[PDB]
């Protein structure tokens, strides 16, 4: 079978919330090491990568590797029926055409069970490069979300410039222009091997910031000629990385 029990079930509520508006359907790769999901959005301008390690679950069982085709809107509907304090257990028989989701309430003598139909997805496998970046910026997730939101009222694109002591975000449009400068903190932390000035579509960053509840911190890694990565830690379990191609 596959069976994993997560005492802190709200994590999974937040993960679906962070994915469902960007990604319609995806494969959940189940294995002994944990859960991995990878998918481009339908425009191919962005990519998301979810990793949940088996260690971070309270129990974890995987007899046979499983590629589970999921409609993320359906899954989101189901997880809505979970309270924020519930213990959530996932369970799939080895020839699964459905996934069981069991919600155990903390306080009350209430248990809920849902059975979700799976889909047949033939997605393309493809490798995310591992690399070292020119600039890495560690900052408050809330602050990054406010910046992306505010700048998107000015223009469609953000230019992100980074130097040793500071990162700048700027946008320009029909009403004029705007720039926001955050100094390195003595919390913002900037590791600049080499300066960047890069342009990205604000609209997609506003999808990525739906992950803000998973972490009070976000990390932006960037280099010339490669997608931006926007990474939220799922503490003691893994992460959600969003990748964004440069805007051309």
């Amino acid at each position: 079978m596959f069976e994993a029990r997560l005492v802190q079930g709200s994590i999974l509520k937040k993960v679906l919330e962070a994915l469902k508006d960007l990604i319609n359907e995806a494969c959940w790769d189940i294995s002994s090491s944990g859960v991995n999901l990878q998918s481009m959005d339908s425009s191919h301008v962005s990519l998301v990568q979810l990793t949940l390690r088996s260690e971070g679950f309270d129990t974890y069982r995987c007899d046979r590797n499983l590629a589970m085709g999921v409609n993320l809107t359906s899954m989101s509907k189901i997880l809505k029926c979970a309270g924020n304090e519930d213990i959530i257990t996932l369970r799939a028989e080895d020839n699964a055409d459905t996934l069981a989701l069991v919600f155990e309430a903390p306080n009350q003598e209430k248990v809920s069970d849902y059975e979700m139909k799976l889909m047949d997805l033939d997605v393309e496998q493809l490798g995310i490069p591992e690399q070292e970046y020119s600039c890495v910026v560690k900052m408050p997730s809330g602050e990054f979300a406010r910046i992306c939101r505010d700048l998107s009222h000015i223009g469609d694109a953000v230019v992100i410039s980074c130097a040793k002591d500071g990162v700048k975000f700027s946008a320009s449009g029909e009403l004029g222009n705007g720039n926001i400068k955050l100094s390195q903190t003595s919390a913002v932390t900037i590791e600049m091997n080499e300066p960047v000035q890069l342009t990205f579509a604000l609209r997609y960053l506003n999808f990525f910031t739906k992950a803000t509840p998973l972490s009070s911190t976000v990390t932006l890694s960037m280099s010339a000629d490669v997608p931006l990565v926007v990474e939220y830690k799922i503490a003691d379990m893994g992460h959600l990385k969003y990748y964004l191609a440069p805007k051309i």
Partner: peptide, 13 residues
């Protein structure tokens, strides 16, 4: 091409 994630995935173009 370069505005699409496909461009950068392994083997990178």
């Amino acid at each position: 091409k370069k505005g699409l994630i496909d461009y950068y995935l392994m083997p990178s173009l």
